[PDB]
Design a protein around this ligand. Structure first.
Ligand code: NAG
Ligand code: NAG
Lengths: 226, 226, 224
């Protein structure tokens, strides 16, 4: 019986606006004799909602329990222990998780790149790049919004954090968005929202527009009619 | 005892300029009774050099089987076979690897993006991105050069190919090269070479320099009547 | 009976992407008693496809034979031997061929020049020259491409490498492409691909057009 209880990820916490735990238990034969419950250091019982998934092809069943806990408990590093009881287990299987301390925190620097002109000449599609670098540790959520309305999660692809070459400890990642030529030429404004723990306000935003950085042009005419 | 044969990759053959074969066998109790032999499909024997690595922490041993084969035969279609004989295994284990067929070919397009103005205003470093998108299959090699001589493999980090949601079956990838602000302000030239199967010459290059894409700031129209 | 066995040059290797051998035999009387077959240094029966040509006007025949070899085998340094057997020859004629060693490597410098303004003023045609200079040894392959499409080999003529008086050992060569001015005044861009054995990636490219050379900052003009 494989009993796993992953910690709540930062991205999931920011997306769902709540703290939910999960004790994934697999390799189960009988799903009618399972019980999943979490507790604190003192021993107070925590209301845990257990759900039963489908039957795995290897004749094994899954038991998932989820509970809602106030961010303060997890943020404080309070240890959460999962309780698993089954008829095939002579003793219950329990695991303890907490927060790893001594973690470096550096606010990420966000850079937004506009589409190359040579690409626009083909009249096919434009690509806007949102670079996020110098963040610690690897927990970053990148979201693209247009005119204050979030976009669908299909139009952009977000990479995974990778170590920086010159600076150990610093990570970096970047995502791209694909838009049609006419929408870009119309004059729409796009924004890149980045969510990180080390940020003072936890949220920073960068915007891009067709008319951004265009230098002043000069049109001089001379007659010199002696 | 597990037998794992790793077929050569485009980048590996493109680098060493030769085709190499790896037949990795792990979970070996005794390393003095292992025979790694490469045999062609027809029946001819291929020389294999046996090399033994260190001892794994889990009381297991691994062996490496290396064979040299002409690159013209790898894409011909004929299969290979790595034979492993050991006292523990009652019968030898065999593996079959070849080049798959049934994948369309597409020409990657290379776009070069200069660093953002905000980063240069901060005056710390500069980031050049060599985007490579619209290709199939997923074997691409990217290298950076400046003023003819190549660059060290530590100054840039590439990303594994990822599917493009807008072009099913077409992939994309991006390479980032970090340089100092002073070197960028000098007026140096940087290039990213891309190697792919579908390219007629299998080599495509793009050039970037501080002075690129600058529009016409002035427009003087001298007139006269004489 | 004369037997000629040429080596596969770099130009052919790059053009057909497959190393091929040839052992031409001339001054032949009977074509029914000729057998051409290549062999390895240690001795092997290399698959040779013998072909029969026509009859020369001087009442002599000729024969050819091809044998495919993995490129690495050739550049490795192995010497070969061509086997010729005939009823009129008491002993077979064997020739040993190999590539020379001990050659300094010089990367080719590529340059592109636009047509002269007088030729355009003539309103007839144009000629673009691709200069490949300062390279050694003398084995180069120049190809032209427009709109990412290889151009008909009847449009450009290439020159065989010639020694450079300025420096000893290095060579130089160039090719010209003729295009009418009607196509030239559309802003068409032309590419000159150079293939060599000393380049890191064996391929170099250059581009030319009207916008190449004109200043980009100011736009001075006259109205008259
Ligand atoms: C500059 O002046 C010329 C006439 O001298 C005119 O054709 C052109 O439109 C002017 N530029 C702009 C940006 O209006
Ligand atoms: C420069 O002036 C000419 C007329 O002299 C005009 O045709 C052109 O549009 C002008 N350039 C720009 C960028 O407006």
């Amino acid at each position: 019986i494989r009993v796993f209880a992953i910690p709540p990820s930062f991205a999931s916490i920011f997306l769902t606006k709540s703290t939910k735990l999960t004790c994934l238990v697999t390799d189960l034969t009988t799903y009618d004799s399972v019980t999943i419950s979490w507790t604190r250091q003192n021993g107070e019982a925590v209301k845990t909602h257990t759900n039963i998934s489908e039957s795995h092809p290897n004749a094994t069943f899954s038991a998932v329990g989820e509970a809602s806990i106030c961010e303060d408990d997890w943020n404080s590093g309070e240890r959460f222990t999962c309780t698993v009881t089954h008829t095939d287990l002579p003793s219950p299987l329990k695991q303890t998780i907490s927060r790893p301390k001594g973690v470096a925190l550096h606010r990420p620097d966000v850079y937004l790149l506009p589409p190359a002109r040579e690409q626009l000449n083909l009249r096919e599609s434009a690509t806007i790049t949102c670079l996020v670098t110098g963040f610690s540790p690897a927990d970053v959520f990148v979201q693209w919004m247009q005119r204050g309305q979030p976009l669908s999660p299909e139009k952009y692809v977000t990479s995974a954090p990778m170590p920086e070459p010159q600076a150990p400890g610093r990570y970096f990642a970047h995502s791209i968005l694909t838009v049609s030529e006419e929408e870009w030429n119309t004059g729409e404004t796009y924004t890149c929202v980045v969510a990180h723990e080390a940020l003072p306000n936890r949220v920073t935003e960068r915007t891009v527009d067709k008319s951004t950085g265009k230098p002043t042009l000069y049109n001089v005419s001379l007659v010199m009619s002696d």
